[PDB]
Design a protein around this nucleic acid. Sequence first.
RNA 1: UGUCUAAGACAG
RNA 2: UGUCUAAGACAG
RNA 3: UGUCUAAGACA
RNA 4: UGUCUAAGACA
Lengths: 129, 129, 129, 129, 129, 129
Amino acid sequence: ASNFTQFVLVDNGGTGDVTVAPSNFANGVAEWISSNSRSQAYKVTCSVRQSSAQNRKYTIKVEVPKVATQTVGGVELPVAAWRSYLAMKLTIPIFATNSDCELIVKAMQGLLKDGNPIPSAIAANSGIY
Amino acid sequence: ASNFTQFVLVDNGGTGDVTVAPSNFANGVAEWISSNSRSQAYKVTCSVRQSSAQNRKYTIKVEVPKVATQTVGGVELPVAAWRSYLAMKLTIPIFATNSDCELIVKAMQGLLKDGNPIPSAIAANSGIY
Amino acid sequence: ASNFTQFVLVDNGGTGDVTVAPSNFANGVAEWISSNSRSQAYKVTCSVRQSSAQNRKYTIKVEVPKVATQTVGGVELPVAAWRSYLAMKLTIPIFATNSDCELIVKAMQGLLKDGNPIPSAIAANSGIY
Amino acid sequence: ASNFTQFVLVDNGGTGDVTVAPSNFANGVAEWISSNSRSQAYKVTCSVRQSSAQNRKYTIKVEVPKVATQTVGGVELPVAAWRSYLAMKLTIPIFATNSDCELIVKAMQGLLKDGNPIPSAIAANSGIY
Amino acid sequence: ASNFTQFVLVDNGGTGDVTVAPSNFANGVAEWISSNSRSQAYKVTCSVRQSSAQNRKYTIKVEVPKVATQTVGGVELPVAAWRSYLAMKLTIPIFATNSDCELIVKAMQGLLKDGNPIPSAIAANSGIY
Amino acid sequence: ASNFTQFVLVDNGGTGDVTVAPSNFANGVAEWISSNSRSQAYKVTCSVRQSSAQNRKYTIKVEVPKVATQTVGGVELPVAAWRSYLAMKLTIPIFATNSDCELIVKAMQGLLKDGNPIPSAIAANSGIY
RNA sequence: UGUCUAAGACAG
RNA sequence: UGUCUAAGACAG
RNA sequence: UGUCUAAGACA
RNA sequence: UGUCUAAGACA
């Protein structure tokens, strides 16, 4: 209905939340960044296109800063040591109804819900065991 | 512990939930599938690799099917009308602390939380505008 | 005396039990078939032969059908939607005594006993994990 | 959760029981080995793979040794006089539900249940008659 | 019996011990890491395979962090300056009984017991003299 | 001081102990052997090298034999039925403090301490699961 | 790197 | 990198 | 589809 | 040693 708005990316219960806001719409790709230097910010981008005859495809990217021992506003090199990148690609058949899509979103939420396998592994620098 | 446990992939309040369970770990790829014919099952796979000398990369995949009954050769078989695919690559630097990773997980959770931009667009067959 | 008798292949309480009976013994190959439409029957075959100077070799095979009705042109027939195939080869040296053989059989029964790894993986459309 | 655990391969009351434990899982091939001299150990291996578009295939193997002492040049070693080899292939279509699989397993257990044809022939160094 | 559990790697008498816990079981290789960023953690991995016809071989690896002047959670480069690596390879003939193996373990313990030559040399940045 | 001293490699409480002593230091490789015929002796060797411009590498080896009496040409000779080999490479950065090294030694000691995962698996001819 | 018959070897 | 019929693929 | 010393092989 | 429609097959 007009969803390109600011939102809470990292929720720490009001006090200490990381908020992300619209920062670019070039080429139809929506971008959101936290209030930092681009080298230390949280960034989120998203776009959809019909990847093929039968499928539509969402491409979502997220960049999370390494905070431990960080120096706010400083020049931290090498860049690859201070940043994590998430790249999501959601392929959805053109036959999926709004309902079908609502379930796909739920599957994604369940996948990452706190306490489940995957998020528990990532959050502990671990694999599956 | 052991993080290789079953979990509810799609939550619909107790009943109607889509729960998925450990099914394979061959070749270092942890697999979870729902209780159905291998042809109609929901599937989730996860794996971690030391992608670089200073990087670790998680590869996660989810397969949400649209079940159906197809008649092949006059006989009916349990099949999937089509499948939706979620593929995410997560690259975390080896210098990332546990708290640093907890931050990445929170970000992904925040990203897909009901009400926020992206999950809203996806659930309505729409882009961000 | 005879061991080419009918037996219970699948036990489901008292009723719902699949029984298979002797049907053919051509070429030293014993064959058992469940009743009714040969097309939807369970099949078991067995044979032994001196595979070499010091070895005897058993060849056991089992076919479990997926009962169904095929309709083509309005004509319907009792068929098997598909079949699951089991084939085992058992090599036993000529030095094995009756005791040694009784042990080999216990090993086979243990391998498929309820609760153990292999039978549990199969019954859940899974592998080892 | 895990099904790559140790189990009782041969049951002989409470004592005299052969137990086999996880030892290796390279190349998607699960392997169990009984304790003591690897040379006189029982071995079990298992694996699954998509054998075709509509079929998955299991490969189970078991080795039962004939414990003995080899003496050569006055030096003696724990060896296996000989080994009995079991090898089974199980093909299951992707349309099989959990129920269908549970049935296939019951068929296998029935095939080797005490008293029935096949297990009795094997345990008596015999064929069908 | 089920040994993949957490244990004390560096014992400093309760207070100040370094504990290591299961963190991965991909490919059958057991991994244990301390609670740190992977760049600063203690890591232990282990696996066994039959290296040849007559031998089994254990491969054990350990990574110990350089702690003096360390900055917890910081990005320390070059990696090679802040880490020590131990790589053990234990070859055992298939004729070794549990007893034989128990003695091999004792030999390893004696080799590293406090006060003996080897550990005394390593602990003093020395060679043998 | 002089760290080149004899020590008890295998401890069995005063009596039955396997003690090994300095035997050679030719070519910079310190050797210790038990008091037996060179053919049945336990052997331990150690050496240190400045492997890199910023690294030092220790190479340690232990040979545990299985003594036996073989009859060759009608005559009996003291021999080893087989040998077990332990080979470990330890790489420590030149920036490692004495306390840093004491940490590495403690880790290796903790690794092989009775009751812990690895020594337990080894002593039982088993893997970690 | 990996393997062994093991401070010397072999197949990268 | 991208795509799919999806841990395996194809066109860089 | 088969054999052996068996996840490697040999036809 | 392997695949399938399975005691017949196909490499």
